[PDB]
Amino acid sequence: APTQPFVPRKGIDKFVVRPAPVGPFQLVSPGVSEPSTLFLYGEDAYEGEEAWLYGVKLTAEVAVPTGVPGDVLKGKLLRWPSSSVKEKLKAADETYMKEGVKRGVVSVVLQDGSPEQAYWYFQ
Q: Which residues bind Cl ion (CB under 5 A)?
A: 60-62
**DSSP labels for 4-54?**
PTT--TT-HHHH--B--SS--B-S---SS----EEEE-GGG--SSEEEEEE
Q: Which residue is nearest to Cl ion (CB)?
A: 60
| Least separation in angstroms between CB 100 and Cl ion | 9
Please identify, using beta-carbon distances, which residue of 41 and 119 lies nearer to Cl ion: 41
| Least separation in angstroms between CB 82 and Cl ion | 31
Please identify, using beta-carbon distances, which residue of 85 and 101 lies nearer to Cl ion: 101
| Least separation in angstroms between CB 35 and Cl ion | 23
User: Dmax over Cα atoms in the chain, in whole Å?
Assistant: 45
Pairing of strands 64-65, 37-40: unpaired
Torsion of CA 42, 107, 85, 24, to 10 degrees: 80
Please identify, using beta-carbon distances, which residue of 70 and 87 lies nearer to Cl ion: 70
Is 52 in a helix, a strand, or coil?
Answer: strand
Q: Are 114 and 5 in contact (CB under 8 A)?
A: no
| Least separation in angstroms between CB 61 and Cl ion | 4
Please identify, using beta-carbon distances, which residue of 5 and 23 lies nearer to Cl ion: 5
